[PDB]
Amino acid sequence: GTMRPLSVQGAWLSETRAFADDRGEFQELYSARSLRGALGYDPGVAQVNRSVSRRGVLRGVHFAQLPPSQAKYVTCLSGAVLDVVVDIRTGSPTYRAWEAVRLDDPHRSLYVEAGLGHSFMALTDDAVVVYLTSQGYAAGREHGVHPLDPDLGIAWPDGIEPVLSEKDRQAPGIAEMERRGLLPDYEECLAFRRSLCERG
Amino acid sequence: GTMRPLSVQGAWLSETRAFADDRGEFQELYSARSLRGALGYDPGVAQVNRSVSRRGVLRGVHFAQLPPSQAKYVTCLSGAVLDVVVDIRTGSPTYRAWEAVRLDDPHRSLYVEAGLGHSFMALTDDAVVVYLTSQGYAAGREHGVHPLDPDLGIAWPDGIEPVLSEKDRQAPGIAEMERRGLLPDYEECLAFRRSLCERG
Ligand SMILES: [Ca+2]
Numbered sequence: 001g002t003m004r005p006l007s008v009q010g011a012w013l014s015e016t017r018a019f020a021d022d023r024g025e026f027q028e029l030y031s032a033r034s035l036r037g038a039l040g041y042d043p044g045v046a047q048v049n050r051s052v053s054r055r056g057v058l059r060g061v062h063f064a065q066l067p068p069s070q071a072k073y074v075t076c077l078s079g080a081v082l083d084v085v086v087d088i089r090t091g092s093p094t095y096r097a098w099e100a101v102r103l104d105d106p107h108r109s110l111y112v113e114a115g116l117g118h119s120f121m122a123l124t125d126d127a128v129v130v131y132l133t134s135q136g137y138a139a140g141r142e143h144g145v146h147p148l149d150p151d152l153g154i155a156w157p158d159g160i161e162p163v164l165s166e167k168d169r170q171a172p173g174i175a176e177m178e179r180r181g182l183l184p185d186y187e188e189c190l191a192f193r194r195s196l197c198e199r200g
Numbered sequence: 201g202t203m204r205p206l207s208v209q210g211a212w213l214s215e216t217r218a219f220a221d222d223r224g225e226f227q228e229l230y231s232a233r234s235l236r237g238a239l240g241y242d243p244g245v246a247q248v249n250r251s252v253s254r255r256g257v258l259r260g261v262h263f264a265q266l267p268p269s270q271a272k273y274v275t276c277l278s279g280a281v282l283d284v285v286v287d288i289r290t291g292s293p294t295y296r297a298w299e300a301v302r303l304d305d306p307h308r309s310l311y312v313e314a315g316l317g318h319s320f321m322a323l324t325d326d327a328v329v330v331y332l333t334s335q336g337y338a339a340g341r342e343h344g345v346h347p348l349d350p351d352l353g354i355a356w357p358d359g360i361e362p363v364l365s366e367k368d369r370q371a372p373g374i375a376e377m378e379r380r381g382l383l384p385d386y387e388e389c390l391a392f393r394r395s396l397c398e399r400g
Pocket residue numbers: 079104105106
């Protein structure tokens with residue numbers, strides 16, 4: 001199994017191996033040892049969440065306030081979603097950049113470190129996503145940026161009408177969140193990553 | 201969400217809540233905070249494994265050598281399995297007892313602490329089980345007892361022919377493992393549980 005960086009620093013793609021035989025398959029979907037080798041730290045699992053989404057449901061762009069924010073390891077267990085990581089970190093060389101990854105097989109997982117924005121859209125009806133998070137979900141620490149903001153310009157799938165929740169529909173754009181001081185700061189994100197590597 | 205003990209000390213049933221709306225559902229499938237409240241410790245997640253099994257495939261009865269053995273939080277994400285926890289602990293008041301739980305919905309999960317034996321049979325073709333484990337899988341520390349041993353007398357489902365791997369077919373019975381000193385000791389299991397509660 002491999003874990004390699006994506007184009008936004010802090011996002012990683014994990015490709016995991018299937019051992020198959022006549023009885024079915026075994027897969028190591030998540031390995032703390034593999035993550036510590038790639039990242040320098042074990043993110044820990046405080047919560048595992050599962051979300052079932054109707055086709056075209058767009059969940060995002062969400063992030064937890066830093067610190068400690070939430071790091072996420074995301075896998076689509078059935079069906080397919082288009083996952084988009086967004087660099088919401090002010091002062092980042094790639095601030096406002098995004099990258100889309102198709103998660104359409106259980107052997108591909110996305111790791112998003114603390115301080116990045118995460119989103120996905122369900123490409124199939126009732127797509128199931130599981131995600132491990134380093135910190136428990138807390139509504140009070142949870143923030144959102146509108147996923148269709150033209151200031152981000154995410155290329156959501158052609159031909160699928162997005163379905164947003166009330167909360168995601170009324171979410172501010174990135175430029176509003178920026179000037180209100182509600183986005184993470186890139187140097188604070190880097191220092192947090194270094195702190196995790198030093199724990200002990 | 202609730203987490204309550206089963207009939208074998210060390211096995212627990214977790215029932216988790218679904219928040220459903222027109223867009224799908226959100227579920228908190230695993231909560232370290234909930235586990236620490238029930239158990240006195242956070243087991244930690246070293247690995248998440250996923251197994252797909254043909255109908256009638258019987259995986260088990262498996263256990264990792266104590267210590268540190270492996271604690272397992274098991275959920276059937278799709279289809280149905282019959283999970284059987286076995287009290288393999290010599291000196292236990294319930295040594296050789298077992299309990300079957302039908303895992304046929306993603307909102308029910310079984311927690312098996314370090315030192316118990318775990319098994320399941322797939323009731324549907326291609327049933328998918330995910331499980332979180334406190335320690336990484338290591339073949340050298342992994343042991344097995346034959347799941348059809350009449351000395352355990354597990355009531356596997358009526359009308360389904362069991363399909364075992366070569367390794368599970370050639371697995372010894374519980375009485376052989378006992379006299380060869382390959383089963384966990386109940387007082388060692390209890391002392392290990394107390395050690396986890398004292399860590400810090
Ligand atoms: Ca697929």
